[model samples]
Target chain A: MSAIKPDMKINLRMEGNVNGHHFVIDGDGTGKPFEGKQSMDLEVKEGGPLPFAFDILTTAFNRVFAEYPDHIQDYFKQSFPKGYSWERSLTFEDGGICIARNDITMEGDTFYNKVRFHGVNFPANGPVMQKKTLKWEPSTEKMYVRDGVLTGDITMALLLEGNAHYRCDSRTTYKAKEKGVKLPGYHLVDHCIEILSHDKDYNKVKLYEHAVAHSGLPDN
Target chain B: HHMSAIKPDMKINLRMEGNVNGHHFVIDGDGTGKPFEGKQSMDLEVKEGGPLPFAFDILTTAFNRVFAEYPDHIQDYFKQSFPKGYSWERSLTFEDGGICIARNDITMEGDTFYNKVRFHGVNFPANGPVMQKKTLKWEPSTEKMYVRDGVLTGDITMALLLEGNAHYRCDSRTTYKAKEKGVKLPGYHLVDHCIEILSHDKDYNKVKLYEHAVAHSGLPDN
Candidate 1:
């Protein structure tokens, strides 16, 4: 009979892909890459909410980036971009913003830089686009990424393989790190997930999605 | 400790009964709502001094006494029955008066439509100064009010002047299509919703009301 106020702020890093365009996700729109168990599942809130609000990610990332972009970008390069592009497609809504690209296409000298994010994730042999959303914050120094984590769930089936099998088959998923052993590639796939769709209309439609593969610049 | 700090010893138990208020609603049963409301309601309230652990336990001792007579609209999702049962599970009743009911495995039972996907925390005002808060539970079955004991339990009532929320699937049925302008799909449909309850209800205690600014208007916290 007492009032319950939400104090815990949960942060989750969603990763998956439409088709071949490998992208990472963080509710806050400020995710990157790294090694040695690269994922984000920082439980900002305890016993509060499962699958916290995606907006929190944007706010949390914006706060961190505004405070330390250099460190963020550096971490993104080291942990994420192996052969990916540098420029990102940023989007905005009435009260929210999203960073995405049409397709990462090759543009001359930039091998991973020139990528095609144009087409949606089509099923069949075309490609299994991979997305990786990582959540990070300035380290204790208030200058570096801390708790730079990522998680994966719900595959994002972008489009159909063909007229016969309209549904995009496979999905991306994340696996927990066991002791000091190496994690599998699919572990990062689950980190890319979403519940609300930000397509034409801010539809509340719940569509599960995931990633298939990604290739980025080796020096990013 | 001060002598005034001593208060009445209150024993709290988590009870899951159907209709804490004796005014059982049954479309048809052995006694049904007709006979149920007829013999219950006024009689039970006064007899129990407001449901269990109070006057009723002292004066009455019948199990499923009232419910056995009324027809029931069974809601298995709520784990509700005409009669009642006691549960030992723990719940977090925040100091601000918000109730957190878990719908996860081992914590949930009954129906799927009964808010199984999500849970809510109802906030109520605290009596003490800032920082000193405590949560308590009393109402087992909502939609029933206990005006007595100076405890005017509260509830929320939402109204949609237009159709449902824009994201609502059924919104298609309620949306209006503007055709005169020549455009086949203007895609313009709207939904307006508002919350209201009795001024005396507990909701006012937890949330700040959007009333005209006066000398005593409550401040917005969020």
Candidate 2:
């Protein structure tokens, strides 16, 4: 009934482009007001894991033109002259339960911000989604608040939906080229989608255990 | 991606919530302290005190700098508003065994703030403890927000008016968490980035501190 503290006290939503994938996280404070004491588990009112593969493709492609314009984008523009809507809202299922929350825990005198979400995948629907290149199982994010926004390691499970069952992960940590490293950005660290074992299939999926992620970014 | 609804504002409210000494409750920021607010900057801007003022020392240091370099015209306006002298007093321990006893007053007029700051016993105790006094004014344009990686993060910028002003101008970067005597409270956020006072400035020596507000835990002496 009461307001969730105030807009600045509690996190209402977090939306950004991660590794080219656009994610919009909306926090539902439909229950008791957040006391700023501990992480509260509120029902997933309307936060995330929506379905928008179309947008994902276009966004991923637009970067192709911008980054590798001479090769990909030059041909892309020549073939399909008029593209679909470049921007639109993401879509999530009308049913199923989802949850989203963020924290500002302090150690000594330094406070760091952390955000975690449970439920659904894909532009996700509830808990499961169709097969694709990268699958994110919703892991707790390790981030430091810069200025007022957060940026750091974000992990997710990647299950190639076409039946190879080739399990994998995606994250934001990068590796150096000095220590036998090959790239400048994230080295695509391997993360175990441990939550896959916890899935039992339902009208939707929600976990009861206090599970933490084993994924660490910054290369293998 | 579904239901694309980003709130109109991005300001975050980091409340200093807990019971330290006898002060137990939530200390709310201006709701513009965090990143996202269009006009978010400075510390304790539009803050309402609860029972007792939170981090009064950190609060004063920030005001002093902003006022010190303020335009002479606005400074005249503050002098014109309040002539009654000191309206309140507060005592705080400094890192160097000395204590900062500030006698101050605040007035809001013409959509801006006028602060009267006086000291008594800055290095010792008060016996008609007289120090220095100045009336400073704070306005919207005096402050700027810190933007990290193209994003406006809530890390504050004190945005002072002068660099070579003096000791007050140098070594102004500091942190203040709300604490009791010296022990930190139970909550997670006591260290506030609300005001960068002068943390990293062109004239900073990086050797000294804004000592006035540097509590044992970067917070206030609750």
Candidate 3:
């Protein structure tokens, strides 16, 4: 078995989005030809107004509709127009990183946000979610990172799923506008986090850092 | 349709698979360069070993600019008889008296008509020191897999295994495959759009698969 590379070396999972707008940020390690750390800083909205209404879901699900009209259903409808998004844990070069994301369109509004944490390893199953120094700007195509700090925002609304009578599993539905028609934000987050976490604990792993290396904003 | 044969004004050295972003290979950009030594005479992106922006429009515009510069016969092929989705515009690099070929990320499917374009302008070491070709076999890689209806598909694997071998024919005379040399690899990224039109036919999605496979022979690389 190949030895597993650290999460700091590889952060795999789906890119995040809100409504239909997307913010793709992935990083991994490239071993040669000028090996350092590289990532895909997908700058779709380099600097612009929040694109959708479901922006703060990265911190926690409850936060998604907590500040809305004070109506739980209204908040859910507004935040999860597509009724699904994603969250994933990332395996890093140094250790492990956790990621969360979602999208919402309601009352004819769109909002998007995805959060990341550095120098921390979270469980794949259930664990108390926490908030850290989370910062994301759709305009700059930059996702900030800090060491030993919790940096994510998941809306508190996610907890509301338990209150529902009937809820279905959220399956990833990739967006069309994306260049490569990548997997949905939610699936990418969960799958990558889970896969890397398991790999680190069990088998040897290799990360494709250069594959997602920052090509800068594509001219096209 | 002009599949399998050389394109009108365009010259293709090696091609097997294609993608919507055209082929994802490296180009010398100018109509010249030392492809093997990795010594490019010019920096097409205007930056040396730095980041090169990827804009679909820029690729298309630059390619068309060059194609239009050719004779009326070639130009006519692009403007008059060309297929609807095929791209005629291209940007080529010129250095060390050699031109590297690559396609714009945009692709047009189906058959195409041709004109009297002279792809002969490209200088092959046609009769140079005939280097013995080397063919390396690599296990194909499948990046993503999704089911359409009941059929499963994703990135189509098209290995230029033969071309790689030909380049490594001799030590002093061997050429490096672009991907192996840190240079961009040319070839299209596969964009297979499979759809299941029937509810009962479990394999109905494969009809589109056949369309793509049949279209392979006529890929724009020709």
Candidate 4:
């Protein structure tokens, strides 16, 4: 097993729901194993409350309920009668996995608290716990590999030094309506991946297959 | 449908078996991960069958409840690893033809929820010494099982193991026959779904097994 060092940088993307509200966050950060603590920090570069329209409406409804309870129904109370929480995990190219617990304390219209990651290992039966740090660096570059074996429109070419490459893409679709609009449609997607056993010199190595999704589409 | 809650002290255990060439191999998953640490270890044992010369796949619905109990973090990691809960690539391989091709992922679609598992087997000379392809799908809804305060129990109802689409093709270039003939699928009645939680702690959870049975004795001809 390859040991994840404290200095390694990682590009992270996470998508799921907190208290039933969907969210996707992408950023760069670094991780370290100090004393008995294994921790990681992500610099939020871009992302937002998914189902953007729904979240907005919910916020408006909550505001209305607080100020004018007689004018608006208790949408927030009914939708979140027991409140909500965010839970997510991480995966590496070299069969390493982590289950992250995002115990968020949402205050006002913002949220805080770093996501603590727990290293996980799969032993055929199921997931097992381990210890590792996660981190990331900003910016990356894409390079073509000569003599690369092309499979369909993508070629997961081998690096000059790495063992293999693993690609993961998650897509979330949304519907929008603005008072008078009848139908709504759009797609939001992002891919976070890794090139296992790559060179020590390069922090971020982009593959051709990852460019399109990583670039993403317009929010509107 | 009501689902089981994960208590701080709840435990679970599950065991299933498959037979190949008179050799019986078992797959066991016990609640072994730390409490609130949604992870566990599965142990495999070869009881009667001679040593397996290669690797194979065992597909079942034994882990559906566990998957459903997964917090978002655990679920997200699995979805990233195996999108759609399926993978054709070599993701996990064990000693005696024990491999993980696909895990039954539990997900929500509108009002209804579904848990499905698709187990595929391929035999190539390079990997082992046979030429075969097998496919099986198992879909179990939450209603099929019951859990309360971490103790889960269930039965296999209307389980389907459709075969005949699988095959073993031989070419003149090389003669290869798998140790066991393909199509050894058991009917729905042969499955065992009794699960129980054992114990839990801040570091881990431990579970015990009832028994392991692979083949059936009496059955009507299909």
Model 2 C-alpha lDDT per residue in residues A1-220, reported as the tens digit of each score: 2211222222233443221233544332211111112221222223234343211211111100111112111211121212111111111232111222223322322222233322212222212333243344434434232222112333333334554322222112111112331212211111222221212221122211122222233211
C-alpha DockQ of every model: 0.02, 0.01, 0.02, 0.01
- Give the worst 10-residue stretch by lDDT in candidate 1 chain B: B167-176
Give candidate 3 misplaced runs (Cα > 4 Å).
A1-220, B1-7, B11-104, B107-154, B157-222
Compare the candidates by lDDT and give the number of the best one. Answer: 4
| Candidate 1 runs further than 4 Å off | A1-67, A70-220, B1-99, B103-222
Give the per-residue lDDT digits (tens) of candidate 4, residues A8-87: 33343544332122344443433221111112232222223122211111100001011112222222122221222222
Can you rank all candidates by lDDT, best first? 4, 2, 3, 1
User: CAPRI verdict on model 2?
Assistant: incorrect
lDDT by residue (A136-205, candidate 3, tens digit) is 2211111111221112221111222234221112211112222322121110010110112212111122
Q: Which residue runs does candidate 4 get wrong by more than 4 Å? A: A1-103, A108-110, A114-164, A168-185, A189-220, B1-211, B214-222
Best by TM-score: 4
Better of 3 and 4 by lDDT: 4
DockQ of 4: 0.01
Per-model i-RMS: 21.0, 24.2, 23.0, 16.3
